Amino acid sequence: TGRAYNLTWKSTNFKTILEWEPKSIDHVYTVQISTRLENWKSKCFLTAETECDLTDEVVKDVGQTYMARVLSYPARNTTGFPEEPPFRNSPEFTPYLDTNLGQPTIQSFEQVGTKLNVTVQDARTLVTFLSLRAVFGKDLNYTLYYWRKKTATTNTNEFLIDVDKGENYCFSVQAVIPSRKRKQRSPESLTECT
């Protein structure tokens, strides 16, 4: 037939890509997206690649549920009765729930005697750009892991806990959206020590 299989979504911080199989020299692929509000619309036209970046379409509204499909077309006019293009529908995808949280980044830190202070860099995504805080608001929290492992939490991008001067601390941060049932946490960031 020529139909694609293994249609899977790859998304982290709203940067979204559809991937599939098989890699072919015999066929090219056309990719379409749709919602319950909008009919199929082509984004990738006759490509030989096996992935398509759909970030700009899903960000129109990250609260909607989307579906994509891969249409296959011969690459190398065989009859005067051309067949209907074979297609494969992808699984459903709801951006705000399904995208993975990306590894955070400690943009700054310092210990003011008995005051340890850490600042998390503001996560964005190259689309304009789309900010994590601009989407999630109060739903996005951060956890701080620290040893000389205890854990602090915050609703903003700033941490300020108490430490004993002279002491040396090591810590790492992690993004968390507690209202999620799965995909609640991101990987821990690189560790930093005072």
Swiss-Prot record:
Glycosylation site residues: N6, N77, N117, N141
Subcellular location: Membrane
Superkingdom to which the source organism belongs: Eukaryota
Boundaries of every Fibronectin type-III domain copy: 1-89, 111-194
UniProt GO BP: activation of plasma proteins involved in acute inflammatory response; blood coagulation; positive regulation of angiogenesis; positive regulation of endothelial cell apoptotic process; positive regulation of endothelial cell proliferation; positive regulation of platelet-derived growth factor receptor signaling pathway; positive regulation of TOR signaling
Segments on the Extracellular side according to the record's topology features: 1-194
Membrane topology: Single-pass type I membrane protein
Gene Ontology terms, MF aspect: cytokine receptor activity; phospholipid binding
Motif range (WKS motif): 9-11, 40-42
Keywords carried by this UniProt record: Blood coagulation, Disulfide bond, Glycoprotein, Hemostasis, Lipoprotein, Membrane, Palmitate, Repeat, Signal, Transmembrane, Transmembrane helix
GO cellular component term, pick one: cell surface
Distribution of this protein across tissues and organs: Brain, heart.
Cysteines joined through disulfide linkages: C44-C52, C170-C193
Annotated function: Initiates blood coagulation by forming a complex with circulating factor VII or VIIa. The [TF:VIIa] complex activates factors IX or X by specific limited proteolysis. TF plays a role in normal hemostasis by initiating the cell-surface assembly and propagation of the coagulation protease cascade.
Assembly mode: Interacts with HSPE; the interaction, inhibited by heparin, promotes the generation of activated factor X and activates coagulation in the presence of activated factor VII.
Family per similarity comment: Belongs to the tissue factor family.
Name assigned to this protein: Tissue factor
Native organism: Oryctolagus cuniculus (Rabbit)
Gene from which this protein is expressed: F3
Interval of the full protein contained in this chain: 36 to 240 of 292
